Design a protein around this nucleic acid. Sequence first.
DNA 1: TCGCACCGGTGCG
DNA 2: TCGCACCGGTGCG
Lengths: 290, 290
Amino acid sequence: TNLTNSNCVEEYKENGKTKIRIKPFNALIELYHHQTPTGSIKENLDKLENYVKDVVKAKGLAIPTSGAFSNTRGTWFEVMIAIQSWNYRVKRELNDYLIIKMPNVKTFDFRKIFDNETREKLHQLEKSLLTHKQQVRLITSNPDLLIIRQKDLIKSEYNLPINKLTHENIDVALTLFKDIEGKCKWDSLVAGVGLKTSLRPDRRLQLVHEGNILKSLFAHLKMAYWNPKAEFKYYGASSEPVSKADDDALQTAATHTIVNVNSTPERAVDDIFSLTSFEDIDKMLDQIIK
Amino acid sequence: TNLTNSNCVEEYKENGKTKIRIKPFNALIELYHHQTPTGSIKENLDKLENYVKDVVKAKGLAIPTSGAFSNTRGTWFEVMIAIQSWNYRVKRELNDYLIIKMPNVKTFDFRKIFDNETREKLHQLEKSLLTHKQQVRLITSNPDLLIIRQKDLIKSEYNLPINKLTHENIDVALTLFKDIEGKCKWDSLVAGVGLKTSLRPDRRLQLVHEGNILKSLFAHLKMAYWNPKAEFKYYGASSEPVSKADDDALQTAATHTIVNVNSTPERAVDDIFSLTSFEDIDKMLDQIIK
DNA sequence: TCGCACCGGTGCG
DNA sequence: TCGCACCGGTGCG
Ligand SMILES: [Ca+2]
Ligand SMILES: [Ca+2]
Ligand SMILES: [Cl-]
Ligand SMILES: [Cl-]
């Protein structure tokens, strides 16, 4: 019952008023410092939410808003996937694959992953797209997970599994991206994944935009290197059931692949996964990689 | 002070519990039955929100959630733009232009606007995109406003201005789409507009997806009819200031226009408007149409 | 200071 | 019954 000394919430000052802030990572640690989560993802998210809700209540404080939990639930789901993806490549012994949880585009633009030769190809494109009366760009939010196949990137440190959630464990999973800055050959990036706790008819179109933009960058790289064999695939994943409507929407073409009558149409999002249990995270990775 | 007899909120039964529901149209009528809104849009939205908030408070009831107001504010902004667009074409005497507020994709798929010859061209595309091992589609939410140039579509009934907000006035603005079912030639549709009370780094990419998909449908129509002169433009509009970041994101290419080194890159969203006052709605329409 | 990216809770047909 | 499309309120660097 010692909820009163929890640190999953945090008081702070704003306009002479004490304000409340959820600490999402702290909530993870306090519930999982002995054992990372198992069973139903959706149920674990609610357990985390009802924990903080009990911490505030016993502390005498105001309930955080629905917006605060949306932000927080998004992080819980991402950290859960990241950690389970870290452990997947260990127990499967995939010594040439990395599954990386990416930060936001300002912290680390995903194009920074690539080597010099490829970063300049992309810069040739970027620069040429601005050299017109009407300036154009190619912008999107960072993919949530990147799957990279490149042997020389794996170090022995990565083969140690994460059995418990600590500030230090979460930090290595969430800074792994740093190790690969500059080192990737263009055709080593093999897939990306967009993660959402839930979908909505509007928010689900964000996955399509993302895949469309990434594949467009990649189609350009296929051309510059004149390599028709290399592929980049993009995927969505939800913590809820995926309806038929969600399915139809996520069948939307990568529009540059439908210009001519003889082109093979390509989907922007190759597939959408409904992650009910942690087991399903393993199942999804099986399809993506193999 | 007679807030107690307002109908902008409405009690209803759910699991033996009386629940509260905002009636957004009713709020509009009760505040604007003598005079449609003028001045600052953003301020009028807050006036509508503080009206309902005062109605519930004086009635003794629970405050509607932040989600309820998001849904409601979205409608207020749309009805305001629609009505002001109705009056724009009247006072400007544009006898060959319609600016139509569109409903959702299930109520009225926007492709229903087109004549038979064009609806079959689109069906040839739709059918061909499914005739592959990997089924693909072209899906998006309905554009908020359509701008259509076709003389034979204007009737004298449309030239009467809307000076006050009544259930009957709002209804004609919101059912105008019905009049044009089947009657549009492909190159009569000249622009679309996506309307948002506010932007966010994720929600703003929805405008890009939309414009990308619409222009892709249109590029196909340009090809089938072999007409290089016809254009379709797509625009965004916010009720808040538009930052530089919002601007950069909305400079994103329509990806099918950047495949070859000699193609002229096209933006998915041709421009983004910050609508501070009702006057700005008139200004935007001036740029779009002329 | 603000930009990024998160997602639930609606009103309505 | 649910699918559509709406958008604010965050935690954090
Ligand atoms: Ca995501
Ligand atoms: Ca809109
Ligand atoms: Cl195991
Ligand atoms: Cl006037």
